[PDB]
Design a protein around this ligand. Structure first.
Ligand code: HEC
Ligand code: HEC
Ligand code: HEC
Ligand code: HEC
Ligand code: HEC
Ligand code: HEC
Ligand code: FES
Ligand code: FES
Lengths: 423, 181, 235, 423, 235, 181
């Protein structure tokens, strides 16, 4: 059971004088020969993808910062200095910019893999909490970063996603001014964002430290509602070399596609308007902040008192909870409820591979995510308003009511024993 | 005493910690160079009355647009009913009703109001810049960030934006100038 | 058909004669109003694009406007190390440094320069000081051409730029019919250069990396199939 | 023996559900209730001082970077923007600048405490190695940082301490250009230095992580040549609350003095010439890089073929080893030998409190350090040249020959037993 | 004796009348050649130093040179938000923004302005275009005054600045003998302000922190003496 | 085979890693905007021959100083013996002996050398700027960074600096100009 196999430091004198600093003991006993089940599909790779992508972003950023100059008058020029003069330039920038896209794409699949195979269910709450914390940090990071080029979309995205904090009453304008460094956006905001943007990744790495510490102490989830049967465990092959090699193969494929993009379709995920300098006096059409924030942008700009299911007219009972504040609360709740999940699913069961109704609702949820992604880009004119309202309502409904009802009446399936599934 | 001494040491440590932390949260506030936040003299100077005039100030645009009769009549024909914000956000006067007579502007040092209207070109939803030049579904301004329709006099309509376009404190400089601040 | 360029694909390293033609046009036509500050003059020798003769570059540089200095205010000789000039206002337009990316890009410029036909049969009078373009979409439209809800019934709109070229505005030294269409294509390619000079290096890197990573991935697949063999043989 | 007292997680349900993430187990069992001897004097505090100073510097820097603009044309102006407009300004800058001084002062006492009480002797080699690595990183950091204000001393200090790398043959100019971003100093160097300067502190923290991991696995030295007698250990009180409170008291005193300096004598340790903008065309008199690099500056500019003990005329046997290269090697060796110490002292003994000859030689070494500090500021004219040569020679002599001879014939003392020294 | 200032110590928050006098002196004498770019004009209302009336500040600002713009090249009215002007070359000197720190500082300025006496009895002819100072140390010296190995036998050296003031150059509105010495002291204090405006806040913070930390340290000493009591009582 | 396949996978991984690392070490090299490194026309234009003339170029100063007879005679009276660097660093000619006849400069397009000398104002020790205007113990230049005494013609003396002050490639522009590059 949970064989650590510390190696007893019996190799030789080198492995015996290393009794001063244990380090190799840690690596070997824990982070390399960690028994993992055999039943792992191709959905348990994306964590390696995320770690590599994080390293990539940190490196490329440390390189760019050697040529980026945070100032309204010299940011655009420095970016062009990069893409033209520097030796590698375009590569670093395109790899930095697009890799953010892959990062978020990979976390999406990392998260939805989790919702299916009960990875939030006990005893794996801490991992979930830490993951939501990370998600928040990395969203804030990417936001701070999209601003640095001082293009045109930078300015206005910052403007609105800071007016949010100002929507709330009493302490809105104060926070807004304390965050922007002033009444509106200017170089001060740029300096804050650069610093902050150059600091959070390390916090993320530490949090990834705790993320990795947790699921090593707590066994990796597995396609089944079963554990490694610790009591000797013919199942649960080790990590190295088997799963290391599997993950590296998938990672090679992913990097292949990523570099093909970088080299042929690099400006595809971007907004052309970010290639024109900023004008605080003129706003372009369809700001469309980005593609990894459209869901929440839509959940925000949906509630506007423009439907018979408009709960804003009812929330107006209290004269303080206006629309804006309502949408902001709705977004914060869209995330808080995803974090609260493990204490809402009242099921003494596990992976939805044995819960059909859950399968249907979950695929509807994935569809809802895609729809929200597609709607945040389209105007607030009919019919898109009804669509956004329906989708947000279903998100909240799933995460609040649907899981309890299932946990109550959702066991028409024969659960599998013997995690050694030699089929 | 055990309790008193221990708890007092802890309290003093906490107080010192807070006194050290506060400035790390104070430096991010507006600095003195941002404290200035003063006025601007924009000269109307025959810009062909009726289209628009925009000028930068305080980091935000200040819209100075003449009036087109059709725009005017549409304005003056708006009863307070069915008007989201009837407060006439203009700070050059009290909270008087959001009426075009009060909402257009001072009268050149003369006596007339249905000819000029200078407001803050900042959407009250989240601070975007609406597009002018007769746009939207009300012959006024349209915000492209979320779709808020403004009217001729700038009062909010058809969107999430709660209130109309504010009007800063401004007076005239004897028939060719504007004082913003 | 769509008049695809050379670089439109996995290959097409910027046929350079096209770019020299675009340069002959840009400096003699577009430069009167437009500028390219984000473009050094020393790039007209760097590989990939117009590999002109450096001496001609220094000559053409000294023959341009006067960029004064950064340390001692004094009108210099506009050395190549400096950037192309900037036309800012009073009847002038934006900077074309990266206009090929702020819009499939070059096709916009081609189909824009192409198309300034007379005013249609909805507003033949047109406008004073503004001219009509088939493809610009961010211009004003008269009320006579708008529909019942503000949308325009015209394909394009009214742009503040006049027609840049006539039937035979300039001569090509290489020998080629210098009609409007060829000039438009050439200048579009030149602007795409000014925006993406490191395109060919991009493509070559992409090829090399695709190859090396396919190799690595194949080898890893073999290693995986091997290691996982004694556990996937009876089923 | 080595009582960890994991606490068995018997507190309550909170301390039992924490069996998902061990964290509190780590803290309690190891990093708080770590048995430390009773015989500790006031020299075992400076590590807490260093940790706090590092945190202070990191914080103040993260704040400054919100207003500093890396560029030749806007650095000085941004520094003045800080010292005038910003709310706290002068405080952050003076605390950042001077705290570096305290940092190095504190590491000096941390290191010399070590040389006395045989803390480099076995079984504490890894700590020593890690500490020298750190010292290097933090020297490089402070150097990169003194440049950012783009004053006058910045430029020339950078110039010379980069010409060093160019002294060596074959690969000198290449490295010089690859480090400066060009033939000479300009904005590129500034960007590199800012980035680098804003990144190494985290590496230092990690290295401090390993630094703390090591001497927790290996017992804290103790004033004597004795261990905690693991086999139950009435000696070795715990860390919390006793030594925590002692260290915090000393730290309060140190911060008191430090803030008195900051508020009354802040520009004392600085160079006034760093308040005039840079002129690449004019060099001031007595550049005098700083005060924590004068020892090595002197060891460098001492060997010049100007003494009968001039080994440069002899090293000229090989036509490649000229003077400059010789001084550079001498400096690198001045540090490498301090790192090699634990394998040079051939003594089966410990703290020099029982080795008199060692006491005398060690106090001579401290005097040599002070002298080198005082000499790097004075010209290379007679007599200072002889002084610098003598001092460098003694440094090398100590660390190479003196310790072996002692380890041979240096045991006229009765060693103390019973680390419980109830005298 | 040494004519210590007010701020020379643990107290001395910049007696402001002295600074107003120094300002009368600086704008009417030193400003002809020197500048203080690193100094905003609005600081003449901020506390600590000359708490002048804002309106007078705006007037004095508009009455200065023309600082053109940063966005649209056009000679503006020079609003207070801008910085003091800059005199750069052609018989002009450095910037006095932080000259009180690039040298005990203000005493240098006092004992420098003080001292321009005639040429000594080693080189009475002197030099054409250069004038003599008894305290500047970074100036040239004639060979007649140097020793056998290049060192100068004079106290100071020859500075390119002429004598700035005579016996009664300007009047003080408050009523005070405006001799050279008082003006020198006043202008020295003004420059020290221009360099260290946040001095008094520095001192007050230092006091507060010394107090709080002494308190904390005393309490920790008591706690230590207590905890370590049962182990240090028999000896 | 076990050995071949495993080792080959490792080799390919290593190769890819190195191909990815190299640019992270290449970007820090001089960029194309630093590649330029071209020439400068400084006009002597009667600057009162005998004191000095300094101009910025390539990021370093280029010293153009006329000659003072006493400085000259001290120069021409220096035998190659007791001269640290006798190579005449000047790159406008071969490694000819560091003699004042070759070491002063071209002759205005005429025939004379003991009147002008333009060298690179960069100490060969570590790149500091020596102080001019007759300084040091040899009537020339003195480096304040470590104490290196230069002579009248710029040859190193009395210090760690190994070689004299180099002389860039320069020719005259017909009696009032200098071409640096
Ligand atoms: C002045 C006589 C011009 C010359 C000659 C050329 N251009 Fe221009 N251009 C000019 C103006 C005033 C404008 C702004 C138009 C507006 O309505 O805002 C432009 C614009 C362009 C654009 C941008 C179009 C867009 O979608 O915003 C392009 C791509 C452009 N012009 C191209 C172009 C070329 C290639 C020229 C030389 C052949 C050229 N222009 C000449 C003014 C003038
Ligand atoms: C031109 C007529 C001047 C006026 C009036 C004032 N100053 Fe000046 N100053 C001037 C020059 C050309 C120089 C450079 C001198 C040199 O030899 O390099 C200076 C220098 C100073 C300095 C710096 C001295 C030093 O040690 O470097 C100071 C502190 C100074 N001057 C003060 C000063 C004051 C207070 C003035 C008004 C009372 C003033 N100067 C007027 C030119 C001129
Ligand atoms: C060491 C510095 C650094 C780190 C670490 C870093 N970046 Fe950046 N980032 C930059 C710089 C510099 C820019 C501006 C240059 C650019 O846009 O490429 C930038 C810009 C961006 C942009 C906008 C790209 C563009 O071209 O508009 C995004 C998105 C972004 N960062 C996201 C991230 C995310 C997400 C992470 C990690 C979680 C990250 N970055 C890590 C330095 C860094
Ligand atoms: C909001 C949720 C969430 C986020 C965001 C998240 N994780 Fe996870 N992670 C999980 C859960 C749940 C598991 C499953 C743990 C288990 O099975 O015991 C997991 C497992 C892992 C694993 C091991 C198994 C696997 O799925 O590969 C790795 C490695 C990993 N995460 C890395 C990362 C990294 C690196 C990041 C970010 C840079 C990240 N994760 C972001 C929740 C998250
Ligand atoms: C988050 C950024 C950051 C960190 C971390 C940081 N500093 Fe700095 N440092 C700066 C900035 C910004 C400046 C320039 C402003 C200044 O000089 O105060 C600077 C300047 C300096 C200076 C010159 C001070 C002056 O005023 O001339 C020194 C010395 C220095 N740093 C040393 C250090 C050392 C040693 C460390 C930690 C081991 C450190 N710094 C940590 C940001 C930082
Ligand atoms: C070059 C040597 C060196 C450097 C530099 C160094 N250390 Fe140490 N450190 C030591 C040695 C040796 C010990 C003694 C360990 C023992 O007694 O087991 C020690 C002990 C410590 C201790 C515990 C006992 C004590 O002396 O306080 C702490 C805490 C500590 N170091 C922190 C730090 C921090 C934080 C830094 C830098 C930011 C640092 N040290 C730099 C070598 C070094
Ligand atoms: S920001 Fe103006 S409507 Fe949303
Ligand atoms: S740098 Fe010129 S002598 Fe040391």
């Amino acid at each position: 059971s949970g064989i650590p196999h510390d190696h007893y430091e019996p190799k030789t004198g080198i492995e015996k004088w290393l009794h001063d600093r244990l380090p190799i003991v840690g690596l070997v006993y824990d982070t390399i020969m960690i028994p993992t089940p055999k039943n792992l599909n191709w959905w348990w790779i994306w964590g390696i993808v995320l770690a590599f992508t994080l390293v990539l972003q940190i490196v490329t950023g440390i390189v760019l910062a050697m040529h980026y100059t945070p100032h309204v008058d010299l940011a655009f020029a420095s970016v062009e200095h990069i893409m033209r003069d520097v030796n590698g330039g375009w590569a670093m920038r395109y790899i930095h910019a697009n890799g953010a896209s892959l990062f978020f794409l990979a976390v999406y699949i990392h998260i939805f893999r989790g919702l299916y195979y009960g990875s939030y269910k006990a005893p794996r709450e801490i991992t979930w909490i830490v993951g939501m914390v990370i998600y928040l940090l990395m969203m804030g990071t990417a936001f701070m970063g999209y601003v640095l080029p001082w293009g045109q979309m930078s300015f206005w995205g910052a403007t609105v996603i800071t007016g949010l904090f100002g929507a709330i009453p009493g302490i809105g304008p104060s926070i807004q001014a304390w965050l922007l460094g002033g009444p509106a956006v200017d170089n001060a905001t740029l300096n804050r964002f650069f610093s902050l943007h150059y600091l959070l990744p390390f916090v993320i790495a530490a949090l990834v430290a705790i993320h990795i510490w947790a699921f090593h102490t707590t066994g990796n989830n597995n396609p089944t509602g079963v554990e490694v049967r610790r009591t000797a465990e013919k199942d649960t092959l080790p990590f190295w070399p088997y799963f290391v090699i599997k993950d590296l193969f998938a990672l090679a494929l992913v990097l292949l596609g990523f570099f093909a993009v970088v080299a042929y379709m690099p400006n595809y995920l971007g907004h052309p308007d970010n290639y024109v300098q900023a004008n605080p006096l003129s706003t372009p059409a369809h700001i469309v902040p980005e593609w990894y924030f459209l869901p929440f942008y839509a959940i925000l700009r949906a509630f506007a008192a423009d439907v018979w299911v408009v709960i804003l007219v009812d929330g107006l009972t209290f004269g303080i909870v206006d629309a804006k504040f309502f949408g902001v609360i709705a977004m914060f709740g869209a995330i808080a409820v995803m974090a609260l999940a493990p204490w809402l699913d009242t099921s003494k069961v596990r992976s939805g591979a044995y819960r059909p109704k859950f399968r249907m609702w979950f695929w509807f949820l994935v569809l809802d995510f895609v729809v929200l992604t597609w709607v945040g880009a389209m105007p607030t004119e009919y019919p898109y308003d009804w669509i956004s309202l329906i989708a947000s309502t279903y998100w909240f409904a799933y995460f609040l009511v649907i899981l309890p009802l299932l946990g109550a009446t959702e066991k028409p399936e024969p659960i599998p024993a013997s995690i050694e599934e030699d089929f | 005493r055990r309790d008193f001494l221990y708890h007092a040491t802890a309290a003093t440590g906490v107080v010192v910690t807070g006194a050290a932390v506060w400035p790390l949260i104070n430096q991010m506030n507006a600095s003195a160079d941002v404290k200035a936040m003063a006025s601007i003299f924009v000269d109307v100077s025959a810009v062909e009355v009726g289209t628009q005039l925009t000028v930068k100030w305080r980091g935000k645009p200040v819209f100075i647009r003449r009036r087109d009769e059709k725009d005017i009549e549409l304005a003056r024909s708006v009863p307070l009913g069915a008007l989201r914000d009837t407060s006439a956000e203009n700070a050059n006067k009290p909270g008087a009703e959001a009426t075009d007579e009060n909402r257009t502007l001072p009268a050149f040092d003369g006596t007339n109001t249905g000819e000029w209207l200078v407001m803050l070109g900042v959407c009250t939803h989240l601070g975007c810049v609406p597009m002018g030049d007769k746009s939207g579904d009300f012959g006024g301004w349209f915000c492209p960030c979320h779709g808020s329709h403004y009217d001729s006099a700038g009062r909010i309509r058809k969107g999430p934006a709660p209130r109309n376009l504010d009007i800063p404190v401004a007076a005239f400089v004897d028939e060719t100038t504007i004082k913003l601040g | 058909p769509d008049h695809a360029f050379s670089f439109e694909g996995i290959f097409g390293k910027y046929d350079q004669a096209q770019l020299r033609r675009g340069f002959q046009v840009y400096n003699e036509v577009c430069s009167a109003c437009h500028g390219m500050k984000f473009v050094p003059i020393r790039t007209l020798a760097d590989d990939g694009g117009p590999q002109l003769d450096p001496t001609f570059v220094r000559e053409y540089a000294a023959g341009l406007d006067t960029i004064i200095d950064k340390d001692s205010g004094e009108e210099r000789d506009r050395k190549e190390t400096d950037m192309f000039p900037t036309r800012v206002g009073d009847g002038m337009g934006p900077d074309l440094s990266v206009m090929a990316k702020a819009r499939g890009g070059p096709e916009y410029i081609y189909n824009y320069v192409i198309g300034f036909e007379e005013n249609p049969e909805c507003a033949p009078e047109g406008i004073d000081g503004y001219y009509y373009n088939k493809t610009f979409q961010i211009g004003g439209v008269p009320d006579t051409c708008k529909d019942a809800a503000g949308v325009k019934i015209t394909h394009g709109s009214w742009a503040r730029m006049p027609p840049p070229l006539v039937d035979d505005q300039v001569t090509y030294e290489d020998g080629t019919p210098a009609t409007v269409d060829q000039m438009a294509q050439d200048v579009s390619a030149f602007l795409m250069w000014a925006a993406e000079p490191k395109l060919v290096a991009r493509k070559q890197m992409g090829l090399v990396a695709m190859v090396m990573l396919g190799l690595l991935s194949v080898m890893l697949y073999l290693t995986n199939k091997r290691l996982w063999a004694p556990y996937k043989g009876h089923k």
